[PDB]
Structure 1
Amino acid sequence: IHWPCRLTIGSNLSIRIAAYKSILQERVKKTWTVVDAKTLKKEDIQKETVYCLNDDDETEVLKEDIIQGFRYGSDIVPFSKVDEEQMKYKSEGKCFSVLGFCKSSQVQRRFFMGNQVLKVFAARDDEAAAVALSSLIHALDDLDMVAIVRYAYDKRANPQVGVAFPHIKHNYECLVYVQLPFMEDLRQYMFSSLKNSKKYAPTEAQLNAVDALIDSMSLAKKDEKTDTLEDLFPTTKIPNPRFQ
């Protein structure tokens, strides 16, 4: 199913676009139901949740006397659901806006976040959107720059910042969008360098052996010296064995 929206560079230029989930993790569509061993009926088995206080008598508390709360460093701060909704960060749903354009080398794939990749084409019918998106894609490809866009599936969905980059092929072209991290997501970990570690310095013979192993275990080959690599082990075309 296509997700329709508008790519908005500013308050005057808007291009109607449709996005599809190009890549998505595949999970089992059918769940597992719990049944009793003696009798194979799910009706008999049922789940009940009981809430009690931290007291000797273990007084039971009704579902209507529970309030949502958060921890604030050894201090408990009540925060009602209605209060959360009232003070929740509101946003304009179904928005696809361009914040700017940055050099492709600046954005590294190691920072890609999220669990999906989107492919954006022009609207289904109109040709003006098609030509506009084609011009934008060609400009980005020629200048080797990628757009930093704001993505929001709907008003409920939390807004995110992602990178949209051109993708041009012999038969179709589009914009590939992948989410980018926030400053909170980044982790600052320090790892000791291995190049200058004297005790971890392999000798020439070790390097030669590793090189020989790498050469002997190549998964790519030369297609009759025609400047076209051939993949011997294309893992991308192997169905998930778990389903089978």
Structure 2
Amino acid sequence: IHWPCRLTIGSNLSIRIAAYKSILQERVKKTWTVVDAKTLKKEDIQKETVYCLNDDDETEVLKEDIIQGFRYGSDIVPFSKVDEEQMKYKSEGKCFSVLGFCKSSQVQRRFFMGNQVLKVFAARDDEAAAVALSSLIHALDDLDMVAIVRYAYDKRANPQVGV
């Protein structure tokens, strides 16, 4: 799927660019669905989770009364989904802005992570963006610098700094 994002530098440079998935660990969509051996029916297979308290009779408790907790030091702090959602925050929109440039010698493969090779093309039917991107590519080729960008897939995706 195309990822048309406004490549922002400073406050004026706004380039429309669409990103695409090029190299990635291919995953099979089909997975072994579970059926009963003597009928081969997934309709008679009920996968469910039972929640019970640490009780002598292990009294069952509902799903609505669950509450998230986190091992905070020598204690656990309870959070709710709405609470943990409102306390967290992230940048919104397609955040793809260059934070500067540095020498390619500073960065080395021994500090590489992730598994996405996100090839970036120009916009569609906009040759001005294409020529600007080509000129920028050649400029980076001449100066042998590297581009540092704070990339976010969307508003919902967690921000990810990278090169």
- Which TM bucket (shorter chain)? over 0.9
RMSD: 1.0
Name the TM-score, length of structure 1 as normaliser: 0.65
SS at match of 2:60: coil
Counterpart in 2 of 1:19?
19
Matched-pair contact (CA < 8 Å) for 1:93–1:157: no
Cα displacement string for residues 11-34 of structure 1 (whole angstroms, at most 9, x for unaligned residues):
111111111111011111101111
> Structure 2 CA distance, aligned partners of 1:145 and 1:121?
19
1:90 is displaced (CA, Å) by 2.8
1:144 is displaced (CA, Å) by 0.5
Structure number with greater CO (CA < 8 Å, separation at least 6) is: 2
Cα displacement string for residues 85-124 of structure 1 (whole angstroms, at most 9, x for unaligned residues):
1111131221210000011111111211112011111102
Name the TM-score, length of structure 2 as normaliser: 0.96
**Number of residue-to-residue matches in the alignment:** 162
Matched-pair contact (CA < 8 Å) for 2:19–2:119: yes
Matched-pair contact (CA < 8 Å) for 2:92–2:156: no
Q: Which runs of 4+ in 1 moved over 3 A?
A: none
Matched-pair contact (CA < 8 Å) for 1:91–1:155: yes
Matched-pair contact (CA < 8 Å) for 2:16–2:122: yes
> Structure 2 CA distance, aligned partners of 1:115 and 1:55?
45
SS at match of 1:58: coil
1:65 is displaced (CA, Å) by 1.0
Counterpart in 1 of 2:110?
110
- Could you say which structure has the higher helix fraction? 1
> Structure 1 CA distance, aligned partners of 2:151 and 2:23?
17
Tell which structure's C-alpha radius of gyration is larger. Answer: 1
SS at match of 1:148: strand
**Unmatched 5+ residue regions in structure 2?**
none
**Unmatched 5+ residue regions in structure 1?**
163-244
Matched-pair contact (CA < 8 Å) for 1:151–1:161: yes
Matched-pair contact (CA < 8 Å) for 2:97–2:150: yes
- Could you say which structure has the higher strand fraction? 2
> Structure 2 CA distance, aligned partners of 1:114 and 1:89?
22
Matched-pair contact (CA < 8 Å) for 2:90–2:158: no
1:57 is displaced (CA, Å) by 1.5
Aligned residues with identical type, % of pairs: 100
